[PDB]
UniProtKB/Swiss-Prot annotation:
Positions annotated as active site in the UniProt record: D35, S199
Keywords tagged on the record: Aspartyl protease, Disulfide bond, Hydrolase, Protease, Signal, Zymogen
Cysteines joined through disulfide linkages: C255-C290
Gene: EAPA
Keyword Cell inner membrane tagged: no
Superkingdom of the organism of origin: Eukaryota
EC assignment: 3.4.23.22
Protein family: Belongs to the peptidase A1 family.
Protein name as it appears in the record: Endothiapepsin
Keyword Disulfide bond attributed: yes
Shown residues within the full chain: 90 to 419 of 419
Length: 330
């Protein structure tokens, strides 16, 4: 089998992407944030504290003939941005772009933090990291991809995120029309539960490439590119007036600037992030100080190849017995 679904930016900055997901019978379609940095499929639901729901579409298990309470199971998650959610668990039929999994754990939120409430466009998350990170207790549950894997034509999914435009998540096949050149594959460590890999270096604008190993995660659920302070300083030093602002919470730059590109290495191959991808707009409405898309990972504890990086590539998440990651230009 295969699946193919369009993923759409939630706003004009590409702060996140939503993908429609069919849950239950009859189908209830929720727009979920596909997150290769976590492993829980959770949704706003009829069980969510009413004051914490503000415009989201909810899953109502009682209206699904295929929903079954997973007795005794609870979940609770906190994300790298400080947000969180928790609740109980149902199993139900879940379909993404024509690909159907029966018995998928659907984690129903009883509580969500303010960040989720305040974002009306995201009805929940669909985790695509390794199932070892799944938070369901006392019986850990599998991701949608893990459940689908054996049925897929090939045990892969691909992320093709757009810049200020829709893109695609495919399951079970590689669309050879979706990228240019060849796909370069690189080793993955699953020791921390993430799609963790090692970039071979970077360049700033038309500058020379610096060969240096940068361990980090391919994370579709993180907006920005978070890299070591040395790398990030070297980037922003090429933008007149750019500075790290403790009050704003990262690098800002004059909105009048033209940003240089940023290149990262995948093996001997190179992925170029155009300068425009690194502009996240005014820090507050009407400001002439703009927020940068490349930020320091210092104090996160891990480097994160988030959407800023991934949207510059066609990315293969290869879930073979020994997983790997593939990157192509597009």
């Amino acid at each position: 089998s295969t699946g193919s679904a369009t993923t759409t930016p939630i706003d004009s900055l590409d702060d996140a992407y939503i993908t429609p997901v069919q849950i239950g019978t009859p189908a209830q379609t929720l727009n979920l944030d596909f997150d290769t940095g976590s492993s829980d499929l959770w949704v706003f639901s009829s069980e969510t504290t009413a004051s914490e729901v503000d415009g989201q579409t909810i899953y109502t298990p009682s209206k699904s003939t295929t929903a079954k309470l997973l007795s005794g199971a609870t979940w609770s998650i906190s994300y790298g941005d400080g947000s969180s959610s928790s609740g109980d668990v149902y199993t139900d039929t879940v379909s993404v772009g024509g690909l159907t999994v029966t018995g998928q754990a659907v984690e129903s939120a009883k509580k969500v933090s303010s960040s989720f409430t305040e974002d009306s466009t995201i009805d929940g998350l669909l985790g695509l990291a390794f199932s070892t990170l799944n938070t369901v207790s006392p019986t850990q549950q599998k991701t949608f991809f893990d459940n689908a894997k054996a049925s897929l034509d090939s045990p892969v999914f691909t992320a093709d995120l757009g810049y200020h435009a829709p893109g695609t998540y495919n399951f079970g096949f590689i669309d050879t029309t979706a990228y240019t050149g060849s796909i370069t594959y690189t080793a993955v460590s699953t020791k921390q539960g993430f799609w963790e890999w090692t970039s071979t270096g970077y360049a700033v604008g038309s500058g020379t490439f610096k060969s240096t190993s940068i361990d980090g995660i391919a994370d579709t659920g993180t907006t920005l590119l978070y890299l070591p302070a040395t790398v990030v300083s070297a980037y922003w030093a090429q933008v007149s007036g750019a500075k790290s602002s403790s009050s704003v919470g990262g690098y800002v730059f004059p909105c009048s600037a033209t940003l240089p590109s940023f290149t990262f290495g995948v093996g001997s191959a190179r992925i170029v992030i155009p300068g425009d991808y690194i502009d996240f707009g005014p820090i507050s409405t009407g400001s002439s100080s703009c927020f940068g898309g490349i930020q320091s990972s210092a104090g996160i504890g891990i480097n994160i190849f988030g959407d800023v990086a991934l949207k510059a590539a066609f990315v293969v998440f290869n879930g073979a017995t020994t997983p790997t990651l593939g990157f192509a230009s597009k």
